[PDB]
């Protein structure tokens, strides 16, 4: 649906709000429709990644940790070490683990760009295509591998997507609040309990 209608199903009070005017932009001389699709798919990607980041930060900072080991060869584990903060756990992971995680996410991103109609060229922003026609690889779909979300009938699905966009935006704000309280003292009134350091965070390796 249109920009005004979307921003009005997301928040009637605020309504459409775009000081930068990127919704009318023309990235790469592709066209306003394609560029609006690109912008919508990024927000949904940022929101999804941010919600996952928040729940992961919450789960792994408290102390929950997997038992099936990572380094291999009967070697001590750096990330499983005291109440280490999650960015420092990521740093403490070995380089091979980080590279392969990033490459797996890269394959997921490549498949999202590849399968199905593209979000820019008349495709739904945020739909993950189905893992089909890949030779010698049959895997559950990334979205709903169990498929227990059939029956919304396209009446509740759009409102659920609006809730996703919201929750995603709030998750971006929350996780960056965590990082800013962590690497800038006093950035948030709460979150002072977070440790004073993380690392560069914007540097994976």
């Amino acid at each position: 649906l249109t920009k005004e209608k979307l921003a009005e199903k997301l928040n009637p009070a605020i309504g459409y709000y775009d000081p930068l005017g990127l919704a009318t932009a023309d990235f790469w001389s592709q066209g306003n429709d394609a560029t609006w699709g690109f912008l919508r798919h990024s927000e949904i990607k940022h929101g999804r990644v941010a919600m996952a980041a928040f729940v992961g930060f919450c789960v792994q900072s408290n102390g929950i940790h997997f038992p099936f080991d990572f380094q291999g060869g009967g070697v001590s584990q750096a990330q499983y070490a005291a109440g280490l903060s999650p960015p420092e756990q990521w740093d403490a992971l070995p380089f091979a683990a980080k590279a392969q995680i990033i490459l797996f996410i890269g394959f997921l991103e490549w498949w999202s760009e590849f399968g199905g109609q593209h979000y820019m060229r008349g495709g739904q922003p945020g739909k993950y295509p189905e893992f089909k026609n890949i030779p010698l690889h049959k895997m559950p779909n990334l979205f709903d591998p169990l498929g227990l979300s059939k029956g919304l009938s396209a009446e509740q699905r759009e409102t659920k997507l609006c809730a996703e966009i919201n929750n995603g935006r709030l998750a971006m704000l929350g996780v960056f609040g965590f990082y800013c309280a962590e690497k800038i003292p006093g950035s948030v009134p709460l979150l002072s309990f977070i440790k004073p350091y993380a690392g560069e965070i914007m540097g994976p390796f």
């Binding site: 775009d18 930068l20 005017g21 990127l22 009318t24 932009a25 023309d26 990235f27 790469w28 001389s29 306003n32 560029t35």
Partner: protein
Amino acid sequence: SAADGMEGISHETGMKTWDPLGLADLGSPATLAFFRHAELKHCRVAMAAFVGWLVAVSGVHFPGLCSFSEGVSFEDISKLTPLEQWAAVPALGKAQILLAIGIIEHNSEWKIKPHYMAAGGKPGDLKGLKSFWDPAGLTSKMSAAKLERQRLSELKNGRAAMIGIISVLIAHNVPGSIPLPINFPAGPSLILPF
């Protein structure tokens, strides 16, 4: 004059085209289009130059080194006066900066087929070089009247900027020009490109 439909009439001199020496009348509409393109180029270069001069005076610089071969850090170069900064840039760096600028200028004259010195002039029009001007579409939110106001503000700011850049460049070199007693940075008022 020939300069009535052109979009540069200010509110400070009044709503009459300030052409006291009548240079707009002398020449063709192609000549006046060349004048407008030159004015807008000088405006844009002067805005960028004044921002660069402020950056150089402040001392903020990129983290890194200009050349891994030559011992020229941005920290090292920031200690000189603004024009000796360019004098201290490496020769190859200056050469490729000028190469990029010249490529941009040649393509501006080439690929924008309805030329400024031609019918359907569009003198300062460099949009057409795709993704060069406003790659992010910031002005795309603006209507016709707002665009006209922004263009007038462009010309006003750039005119002031090209006055100011020359002012700061000459104020220390010839003392007493600018009445203010602020101690402008030393150094040349003019640098040869290589």
